Structures are given as C-alpha cells and as structure tokens.
A paper describes a structure:
Of the [name] carbapenemases, [name]-2, [name]-3, and [name]-4 are the most prevalent in resistant Enterobacteriaceae, differing from [name]-2 by single- or double-point substitutions at amino acid positions 104, 240, and 274 ([name]-3 H274Y; [name]-4 P104R/V240G) that change β-lactam specificity, especially toward the oxyimino-cephalosporin ceftazidime. Relebactam cocomplex structures were obtained after 16-h soaks for CTX-M-15 (1.12 Å, P212121), L2 (1.78 Å, P212121), [name]-2 (1.04 Å, P21212), [name]-3 (1.06 Å, P21212), and [name]-4 (1.04 Å, P21212). In the [name] variants, structures obtained from diffraction data sets collected after exposing crystals to relebactam for 16 hours were observed to contain both intact and desulfated (i.e., in the imine form) relebactam in the active site, at variable occupancies. Consistent with this possibility, in the [name]-2, [name]-3, and [name]-4 structures, inspection of electron density maps indicated the presence of desulfated relebactam, which could be modelled as the imine form of the inhibitor, with occupancies of 0.35, 0.33, and 0.65 for [name]-2, -3, and -4, respectively. The imine group points toward the flexible Trp105, but otherwise, the DBO core closely resembles intact relebactam. In [name]-3 and -4 relebactam complexes, Trp105 is modelled in one conformation, similar to one of the two conformations observed in [name]-2, albeit with high B-factors (30.95 and 33.19 compared with average protein B-factors of 13.61 and 13.24, respectively), suggesting there is still flexibility and movement of this residue. In this conformation, Trp105 faces the DBO core, with the nitrogen of the pyrrole ring ∼3.0 Å from the relebactam imine N6. This is concomitant with well-defined electron density for the relebactam piperidine ring. However, in each of the three [name] complexes, in all of which relebactam was a modelled as a mixture of intact and desulfated forms, Lys73 is at least 0.4 Å more distant from Ser130 than is the case for either the CTX-M-15 (either conformation) or L2 structures.
Residue numbers in the entry: 25 to 57, 59 to 252, 254 to 294
Write the structure that this text describes.
C-alpha cells in the first residue's frame, strides 16, 4: 500500500535545488506515500512538538508539573523567544512554556523544558520509550540548528517523525487527556500557515509543528490532519540543500504536502 500512485517529488526537489523527504500515512487504510522517507534530516525547531509530548508524558506521573511556575534570567532568552521574553519579569508555568515552544517555536521555552527532562538525551530517551529508534537530539538551542551535511546529530527521518506523531496524537503513547492536550497545542500553532496547512482545506482540522534551521535550505513541518468524513492523515515534510546559504522554501513544503495528499487519493 506504499506509493500506489507515483507523484513528481523528484522534479519538485530539483527545482528547489536540494532534497525533500516525505512520509504520509492514511490511518484508515494504512496506505502511505513515501519519498526519501528513511533519510535523515535536521529537526530544527520541529523537535519542540516531541518535547511538549515528553513533558505531557512526565505529567502523568507528576500531577503538579504543568502548574509549576518557572522563573528564568535574562541569560535564558536566546534569539527567537517571542513569548518568554514578555514574561521574563514574572515567570511562566511549565504548561505555558510548552504551549509557547509548540505554538510560537519559543527557543528559551524549549531550553527550559529540555532542562526539565534531563537534556537532549532525556528527550531522546522518551522517543525510544515509544518505539522510535531513529530520532536523536544531541544539542540545545541554538546549536542544534547547524544542519551540517551528513551530520546525524539533531536529526530524524520523515518516516519516524510521522510514526511517532501518530503514536502520540492518535495512538496510545499518551494517556487520553494528555493526548488531547498535545493535539490542542499542535492545532493552535501559529507558525505553519504557509506550509502543510496551505495544502489543507480550511474546513478540515489540522495541527502541526514547523522547523527552520536557517542554513542549508533546511526546513520542515509535520502535521496531523482530520479530513471530514474519513480517518486522519499523519504526514511529515523535511527539506535540506547542499550549500550553507541555500534558502529554505515554505512553498516547496506546501507543494510536497499537496502531492502527498494527492498520492493518498484524499480529495483536497
Ligand atoms: C526553529 O526552527 N526556529 C525557531 C523560530 N521559528 O521556528 S519555526 O519552526 O517557525 O521556524 C525561528 C527559526 C528557528 C531558529 O531557532 N533559528 C535560529 C534562531 C534565529 N536565528 C536563526 C537561527
């Protein structure tokens, strides 16, 4: 049921000047669209969705976790911390940092939450615990964005991203209340309007998390999509390119998402 219908991903990536990796699953039939799906691509900010899921998993054992207020210093505010910079003088709760990391891609929030989990290895351990043997987080913000060609640090594959996203949003990897909180955070993302969402009809529900490393044409998005009248679709679209100053493209991500939906025979 993989690639029943071929789609022109090769032409798309050639025009982009790099590589595009796609994995999309129709959770009803199990049909898939797969292109470069087992290659590694940098996560960039996209690790923050999984980070929030890991915090939610912890919260199942620690009922006071999400309400815990976290104070932080000005030194915590690395570049691109749009929410946490507004609460420097007050603090934010763990839940609020999680929402900020997911919905505004807040970097300070992400580092504070990584500390809660025991760092990159702690997040990696959570991903192993759900059966993902591909994901690896190695570094913190901002160093994890280097996106060096051939470097496996801070990467996953489109396939493993999709598989893990399915387990966490639709499967049993989180308890039901936490699963719905994760979904709600993804649905409230503000940074993805020009990526997978641009390929998804306005009357379908969707949650996503983006990433943009800033170098090597490297950017991404993953999403759960609920078309009306049929089972949800999970998909991941990752890009990279050979040269350090190659620019990412949101349009290319949207276009790859459209091809994926077409390949699944989802009328959109
Ligand atoms: C994540 O990849 N980020 C965080 C933020 N927006 O995330 S995104 O998924 O919407 O793109 C800005 C881009 C990126 C990031 O951390 N970039 C570094 C900090 C800002 N200067 C460039 C490198």
């Amino acid at each position: 049921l993989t690639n029943l219908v071929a789609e022109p991903f090769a032409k798309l990536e050639q025009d982009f000047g790099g590589s595009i990796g796609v994995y999309a699953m129709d959770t009803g039939s199990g049909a898939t669209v797969s292109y470069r799906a087992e290659e590694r691509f940098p996560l960039c900010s996209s690790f923050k969705g999984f980070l929030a899921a890991a915090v939610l998993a912890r919260s199942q054992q620690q009922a006071g976790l999400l309400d815990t207020p976290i104070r932080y210093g000005k030194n915590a505010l690395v570049p691109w911390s749009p929410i946490s910079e507004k609460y420097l003088t007050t603090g934010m709760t763990v839940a609020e940092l999680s929402a900020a990391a997911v919905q505004y891609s807040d970097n300070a929030a992400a580092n504070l939450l990584l500390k809660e989990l025991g760092g990159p290895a702690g997040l990696t351990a959570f991903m192993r615990s759900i059966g993902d043997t591909t994901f690896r987080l190695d570094r913190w913000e901002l160093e994890l964005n280097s996106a060096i060609p051939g470097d496996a640090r801070d990467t996953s594959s489109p396939r493993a991203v999709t598989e893990s996203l399915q387990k966490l949003t639709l499967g049993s990897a989180l308890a039901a209340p936490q699963r719905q909180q994760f979904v709600d955070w993804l649905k409230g993302n503000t940074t993805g309007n020009h990526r997978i969402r641009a390929a998804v009809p306005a009357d379908w529900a969707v949650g996503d998390k983006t990433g943009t490393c800033g170098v090597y044409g490297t950017a991404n998005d993953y999403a759960v999509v609920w078309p009306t009248g049929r089972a949800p679709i999970v998909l991941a679209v990752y890009t990279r390119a050979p040269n350090k100053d190659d620019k990412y493209s949101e349009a290319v991500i949207a276009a790859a998402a459209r091809l994926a939906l077409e390949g699944l025979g989802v009328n959109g």
